[PDB]
Structures are given as C-alpha cells and as structure tokens.
Amino acid sequence: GKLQDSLDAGVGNLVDADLAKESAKLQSLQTKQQLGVQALSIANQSSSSILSLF
Amino acid sequence: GKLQDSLDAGVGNLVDADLAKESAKLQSLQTKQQLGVQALSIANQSSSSILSLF
C-alpha cells in the first residue's frame, strides 16, 4: 500500500502543473493579448496617411 | 516490570509531541494560509492596471 502511494506521488510530481503560477500567467497573457490587438490595429492604419498628401 | 515502564516513559518523553501547542499552531497556520492566498490574489492583479493606460 505504501509503495503504490509513493508511485502515485511520483507520477504527480512528474506531470502535475503548478496552477498558482498559472493564475498569474493567465492574467498577464490576457493583458498581453489586449495590447497586441491594439498595436496591430494601430499598425493597420499606416496607409491612411498617404491619402492626405493628394 | 518497573524498568520496562521507565523505558517506555523515556521513549515517550523523547519522541511524543505536546499536542496543546499544535492545537494553536493549526489555527494560526490556517489563518496564515488564507492570508497568503489573499495576498497572492492581490499580487496577480498588478498587470491589470496597464490596460487603463491604453
């Protein structure tokens, strides 16, 4: 019984994720995604400045 | 018989914990864990303020 418990604990050590860091990374990457969308939207407007010169 | 009783009492003195102290340490560490969870939840929000600037 103890050996099987140790084996299960070792599997969990190998594969289980640490969600405490994931909670911070999730919000950080949501903010990153919002800024990336806004920056790409700004970059889409480069051609509009040409029309003013004509 | 008296010597065996003395030896058992000696092992108990040398290993056994006094659970009245852990009766308080349990509650203190439960409160401290809740406080740490609260503080970590506050800390993960540090990146949220960037969206307001853009």
What amino acid occupies position A45?
A: Q
Method used to obtain the model: cryo-EM
> At residue A17, what are phi and psi to the nearest 5 degrees?
-85, 155
Resolution (Å units): 2.7
Handedness of CA B22, B25, B30, B36 (dihedral sign): negative
CA B50 to chain centre: 36
Nearest alpha carbon to residue B45 among A31, A39, A48, A17: A31
Q: Could you tell me the two tokens for A42?
A: 């700004």
Establish, for the pair of chains A and B, how many residue pairs have beta carbons separated by less than 8 Å.
21
DSSP state of B54: -
What count of Cα atoms within 13 Å lies in the side-chain half-sphere of residue B35?
Answer: 6
Would you call A1 helix, strand, or coil by DSSP? Answer: coil
Alpha helices (H) along B1-54: 2-15, 19-43, 50-53
Q: Could you tell me the two tokens for A37?
A: 């969308």
How many Å apart are CA B3 and CA B9, to the nearest integer?
10
What amino acid occupies position A14?
A: L
CB proximity B54 to A under 8 Å: yes
What count of Cα atoms within 13 Å lies in the side-chain half-sphere of residue B10?
Answer: 6
DSSP state of A45: G
Q: Could you tell me the two tokens for B27?
A: 């509650």
CB proximity B48 to A under 8 Å: yes
Judging contacts by C-beta atoms under 8 Å, the chain A residues touching residue B45 are 27
Contact criterion met (CB < 8 Å) for A31 and B44: no
